[model samples]
Target: MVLRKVVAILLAILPIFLFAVEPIKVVRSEKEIVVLTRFEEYHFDLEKGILKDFYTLVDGRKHVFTYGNDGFDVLDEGTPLTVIEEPIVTGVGKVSEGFSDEVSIVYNYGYVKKIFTIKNNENYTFFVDIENSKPVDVTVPRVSVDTSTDRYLENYFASFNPKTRTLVLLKHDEGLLFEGTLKVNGQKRFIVFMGPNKRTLIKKAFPEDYDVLIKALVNIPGFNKWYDSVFYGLVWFFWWLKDLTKNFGWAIMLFTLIVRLILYPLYHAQTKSLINMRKLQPQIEAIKKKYKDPTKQQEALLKLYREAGVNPASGCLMLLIQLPIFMLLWSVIRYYVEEFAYSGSFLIWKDLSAGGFSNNWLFLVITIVASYYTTLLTSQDARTAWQGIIMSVIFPFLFVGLPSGLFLYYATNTLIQLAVTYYTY
Candidate 1:
């Protein structure tokens, strides 16, 4: 039975092992160059030295893209024997330091250039540019990508300098037909891209959350690397906690506490300012009545604030600090859900990754109560306290479809907030 259980666990994790991570591939002949990465393949023509054709795997079958016209073709240009050079391929690791095997090949044809790079562990990094250029026309065959469940109908191509240049746009169902072309001058180069439409063709690679997590990971002076490191470090902390407690549910809660503590000073300051603002309410009303002139009332309120040395806007400080952490956490869990394939269990809830009050009445009740008590504690105004009660009751439903993992976060954070408010009060 133990052996059987181990096998069961292995089988459960098998898909994660299979997901992505294959080394990028580059192969060529005197006539052609094929850049094959995990999701799709690119084919470059010999003479034109531009994208001749490509295939994106859909349904475990490759869809061949063919048209009388070439993809990303430079209408007037050179195809350098730069393609004649010895080809590039992957190694276990390079002679230098690198984690994944990758490659990029560029053959500059007299300033009309199509630049593309195949990255092993990331999304497609290739793009195009024209230098001492001419009009670059991009045309794909009558039909390509996924003919069924089409994305063609949703969008046709448009360009920067503008391409209502009357290029034909076609959307066909069973045959999956689409054609578009945009042309721009040598002075301003226009570039095009490869790969199939998303809903089909390359669905596995780009999913619904493609808009969510895939868009992160950026660049700056080192600011880009700095931000990347920060997000990665937080993700590391989560996985580390999960390793110790063996439950992501508690790991997330513990992670939330640590984040809250780090921002506690800001939260403390916010709480301080809010209390000061509340105390000033009587004075503010007095000013309102005393300085019957609206402009004078505004001046008196500012004067009161300056005297108190409290910035009312400090109320937004904790919120601003908390938003980045939540954004990172949101993307973190989203990426990991695809990686680990399950959510950790807590209480009566078996899947923290899931959401709603469905079968878990206890999770729902505690969340509402925590929110209710935290709000009342913060204000300490009986007149406003009932409003907190009503708002808290209505709040959780808006999150009905969000992951319970996130709800658990706000819920646990609400508990800490209650503690913070109590101490501040």
Candidate 2:
């Protein structure tokens, strides 16, 4: 949670770049492409996939072209550039080699040529013009690019049109990469996904224990198209759901109600466990009071717990059992944030569903306050009351900076719990 100290230490104590060797020199003589990185000592041949391909020339660099999705070729790693189309599929390109794994690459032709920078943050100021009727490939030699030196897989790059003007700090587990669009004169669009050669580990981590996590979440019926179909369908459904009522706030409340209804059976068992734990608390306290001698407290407590047919550690086991679901719900809320970002909001709150606190302060306040109150109401231990009070007072401020969607989910959960506990317990 508190990672500033850790990041600061890493920056100050560790070397900026870990590698000692100069960047490898890579070249494609036939394509007239000469690539090199001054940061590390490495050579690549985009054509021959051999570091020694350019040996007859200055550095003897090899060339490997990483094919992209949008016809934007990423030149990386010396390799055998053999094109392949596995089992033949319609609508999919017969990608040359493994270059079909492309990521987006957007750049400006006008503004970036000089030392001065463009200021207007407009969307789609410049684009890859495809209207010109020419069979000729234009060679724009003024561009500088960054890609992998060892180039593991293909399609390591891609490019796209700007749908928005916002910039995103794309964080992977290893580090952060900046990706965004720069709009020059409202029509000039330049967006680039430029970063170091390191692979994104965060996106890769989910697949590490692939079978357990992916199969459970992704293998379910209709879940395969999580991004393409299911998510979009939910967006449309929520759109109509919200349209049935005017208020966005009420729409979210309705959404929560739907989810609660689906999970009602699960909560019945959960609330029953809570009641059982509360019922056992008095017995636990009596055991503690009866163990007057501090030295014999542990033995006395265990004995009383056995007599009452309640394991002292049962509470811990119950908490542990609930934790995975709690974490999964948080993950779901995170998913909902992205889901709602594009669906226009009807409230003055703008995109409250997106989970960002940067623009709206009041939404931030309500969620923080609600979370603190939730924590305060749940903390039952007298010995830990001061800690709870301190946390209650401090946590709101800390959580205020969290994404609004996350806040909304947390606040909604707390409100539901409060309502249920007030009525039943």
Candidate 3:
């Protein structure tokens, strides 16, 4: 009897393993968004409390998107299904389903003869193709435009045009220029214009909270691709490889330290040269008085610099070389904030990164003191105090709107410059 019971248990579980597999193919054709699915279950009807009653029938697998009453649901309160052996076709507003083993859904947008094919399966490839046809231009809204459903699009794209070879402009993400590409008559041409939002291509694979985590990683300024690609890449590569157990913000901070160390040598050289030049400032001024001619004074100064084994041009070059790395870091962190809408404080007594001002009154006091401290240190050389004015006062306030990573980089750079001056002098 025990053996029979074990066999029955295996029998009950076998269908689940087999039925939960399918291949999904989504294609956007001129006629509609076409989805070809194999061995994937489909949802025909999901009423309230139906999931609880038919838990065994539901496979709990969704694509990169979830279905809603009229559109896809981003929220996770819906049921997912395994593989089914059928197709559901919809033309314009009408949806029809035939009796089949697998379940599939066709979403029809009445506006531009588009169809969305949604299926749940083992392998899914979504392809949106616009057939060569005369395209119509229409104006899309700048703000959130609801589809009379809970579905929302943050940015919009215009429709695809085939014959006239003109891409139309419409809704787009703010501050970004957009274009489209398609293969028409075996020729590939990039469509330079706007496009309509292809709603069916949304991925259901990622969890909603993934955006939140990624945004936190981007909140740091200096963690962009050009500067910190390898670092962020490592975090993503490992996070995906290890099942995403690690926090990504911690990854950015570690990457920041690594970058700081790599640039340390160049920084050391530049700051040392600055300090040495400061030591010779009085002599340089005396030469300026003796020559009276600007050209002659410059020539004498150049000779003095050469004799002293210093390069007057070194400081500018070093800073310029480091600028690209800094810019890339800004890009990375900025993207993160855009994706996640993250707002949080990094250090004590300030909230510059979080997009909100400091609630504490003492933050202003700390900022003022830090500013003075930086000014006093850098101004010791006093080459007309212009650079000091820029660095200590003007620059910080100018970059206050920047992300925390930039602030941190500036602060560190100032600190390093000061230290180099101290030791070299």
Candidate 4:
């Protein structure tokens, strides 16, 4: 644990080198009306009176989340009919900790008077309009990020409901996706969100109860189809634990605990079988010298295996069964971190959901070393010990991309394995 201690000491002396506090401007030059938030500037067409889908200045770069002549529409199956026509600017301005400009607009086609309340913010916007108690659709927007860099070539979309307040996050790129909401009379609220590493979107959504939301979203298991029955159970269990504790860190810790307990029987047998083989090792070696025929050697080995009462693959069974569990937890826990901000600061580390070598090197080193040491200690022979050392030292490198939160859980798994060997030592 030198790495962990060193990290603590370094943090103590390293002088924690670390550490929204908010506007909108509107302009209407009869030929055009422009709305500006701290980072966004929106333009309205004077003739068509529509905010045509297009790009504008954000981060001082030419960008806009929605681009295409933007306005409200009525749809049948999939055909677009215009609801907002020749519009009159009804309202304009800007909040406590909110940096969005609300502009009001009105137009009519018979009794079809459409009034718009566009609460346009920095990273996303709320598009709502009032009309007859019957008509129209939502703008998923031409929503792909509006940047000049090849930084985002691919992205994903997650369609959601009042978990409308639930987040859809992207890791290495940008986003502009519509999160679903509610309808009142003929009006519907649609959230068009963007991410460029992103947040301002989460604050705009304002959060929720999220009880059934987590498991169904990307509960770490939605990526596959291997006995989704068992996969779904753990997803809810972790989600339930996260809710009960009001924290994901504890939820994660406790979940790992139970996960360990579930696999306890297999390794317990593995330990027993290893020790029995220790004494039986001598007799088995002589059997190889005594039996000239391969059949005779196999028969003699099975007979001695019965005497020792240790299956040859006992340890293998434990490792193989636990492998898939580790695989599934990675996806679920990362999603949990995405859903809430609370879990990553679990205990000593800065945040678990964030992945990188920046802070996780210690946890990574400790995990590899401990598992390597544990394997060597439990080896039944020189050949096996070295083989175990090579496997333990080299193999786990594949998983170092842990969200340090899982790093702690993973290192804990190794330490527990060490402890089990300590028990059987």
Candidate 5:
């Protein structure tokens, strides 16, 4: 039986092991350079002097980015291309220090000159000039990052963030942006800084307003500007706590505590309602026994709850209010916490943003144990107990791939919930 149990556990965790890493294959050619990372493959065409293909790879599947006709077009003046003074020059070289893996391409059109510089560590930067020729109207088209095929990218809302002085594309828990744009002496230069959205990287790319940029990246979508006002405030609060504590782990704990304190009133009401319902259990049971009909039992239960000053809807209302706040917190964490993947380890965890416990079983164990304890402390209802069990099992697996910081938030919140339940009753 013990052997069988171990095998069963191994089977349960097999998926985690499989999901631990992704395979990437890089293919390069003379005319086209194809580089595949864990998440996506970027293709550059030297012959056409344009970015030929950009696609995301997931679970052995590929999602391509379809651009507009003028995608990455340097000089889009509705003019037909003719022979230039100089031929298209393309070269790839290694960087010694600052940044590595550089690909440079120069395109000269007699009247205009465009230079494409792409760095592996940094992103693509373009330099456009009118050259020694006469001035002509030059319009550099913005590369439309289409996501009609991928649901994940489809949900992303793109907009300009004045705080960062950059255009930002944001979804629930991810973001992308260019560092900034600049124009000098009728010449245009811009950086297409892509990859993982890290505040540090943004600061490195555009340092003049990094502080404000950090706030702007998460404050996308003016439609939810009101909600984002709350989100950005909390984000800043977390940073403030991080500065105060000098440790991100403790900062997360304190942030959780602060949030719990702010929402204490609503949580208190829910706890009180649960306590009152527990106190009236005998009356509730009697009503159920007296009314053989389901409809009549529900009516009696409602009447009893009303008379006892217990609002059963109170729990639901609290959830409704808490849900948005929770989502906002989630977004904040997802955007910033991963940066601490290697730095935020505490108490046997290696990385706050990486899978731990030899496939993140530690998170699963903690979540399950906390859920069980929380269920016991708050309510003994078989329904709630069953729900706890289901969530404890489901949430761990769902979070296994997430950073340890997020799991820490969940674990810390669970502990707070258990503590609140202990004191409330």
Candidate 6:
């Protein structure tokens, strides 16, 4: 009887202790409302009633969330919204006299009030409270989110979870936010919970809605629907390596090493054939000089290649085999160039998604040097070496305008070829 009474007393006291906990501290400025948290900072426009900036520190870098301007808005489904002469709200004030930090904004139409509340933790709650003064059926089919055109917003999509009464816009990276709704005091309140898309943060901050978030996990289309699985699988696999290493640049280097190791045998065979062809170069020149007919010269060259145990068709077949892999890698890497922009920087290259050799001429210089060295190892003579030299310059310039991941792969592969040359020769 004493134990039961003690347990009941503790339960009663817990609610009082919880209510005493301090709320999130906020700073209000002329232009923005800044809500400071341990993990992130949320900035909102006081007059516009919109989210202007959201910054989170990840891996020692500040990652900003980009969304369409005017923050979150509710609209009745109809024609597209082009111009807005009036403001979303005319005035902002506290929800009540006592709760000064928790405020509401008065909108121009339909007796709407927007509520802003920052919880004790990192996540913040925003609501569009609509009250119908007169009883009538109304519909708001569109809730628009205008995210900025940042790289992080590249491959994201929206999902609605009826079970949790929430809608989420999420990406594979840690970029996500969700909305829920409730009815109170003859008004319908649409609530939004915005925070990092990480599961640990979501679980700790929004525990009540975490299960629904898991169920709503999906791939938003940035490419063909049919190829989503293939593309997603490749991207996710690369991320797996990146997560293990904690550096995507290093992950790309390791990936290149593995691929080169796999293709080394084919490359060795191709090199041997090229070497033998160089040996027959003098005879081939004589054949070209003596044969009057182009057809006769081609037949003689084929006969020589057969006797020399070099298959020209095999080199073409090898190229065909590698093209598909290159295409797949290109598509997957292109999409994620923007997705992993902040996380993919190497030593000298600050932004991997920036694309182009403008930032680091040294990396491009090393690429050219590596290509020249690798080309010399496999070339027959000065004439053959000339073609390789021209190609080495052309290939790097061609890919310089592409994502850094693409260029990294090319540069690493070329370096590996130089190493292989010494080992093989």
Best by TM-score: 6
* TM-score of candidate 4 to 2 decimals: 0.50
> Among all windows of ten consecutive residues in candidate 2, which has the lowest summed lDDT?
114-123
Model 2 CA deviation exceeding 4 Å by range: 1-252, 265-271, 280-290, 293-297, 306-348, 353-384, 390-401
TM-score of each: 0.43, 0.38, 0.40, 0.50, 0.53, 0.54
Residues 343-418 of candidate 4: C-alpha lDDT, one tens digit per residue: 2355546556666776577776787678667866554556655676565556555665666667767777677777
Candidate with more favorable, higher lDDT: 1 or 3: 1
lDDT value for model 5: 0.52
In terms of lDDT, the poorest run of 10 residues in model 4 is 145-154
In model 5, which residue pairs have backbone atoms overlapping below 3 Å?
352-404, 353-403
Evaluated against the true structure, the overall lDDT of model 1 is 0.50
Order of the predicted models by TM-score, top scorer first: 6, 5, 4, 1, 3, 2
Candidate with the larger TM-score of 1 and 2:
1
Instruction: For residues 36-132, write the lDDT of model 5, one tens digit per residue.
Output: 5434456766544455655543224343343343334444345434335433434444323212244445656655556655443422223322232
What is each predicted model's overall lDDT from 0 to 1? 0.50, 0.35, 0.36, 0.50, 0.52, 0.50
> Which lDDT value does model 4 have at 26?
56
Clashes of each: 1, 43, 26, 12, 2, 5
Model 6 bad stretches (over 4 Å): 1-180, 183-224, 283-297, 313-319
lDDT of 2: 0.35
Maximum-lDDT candidate: 5
C-alpha RMSD of candidate 6:
16.0
lDDT string for model 3 (159-220, tens) is 22222211122222232333221112311112111111111111122233335323432342
Segments in model 3 whose C-alpha atoms lie over 4 Å from true places: 1-254, 283-288, 293-297, 338-344, 347-387, 416-425
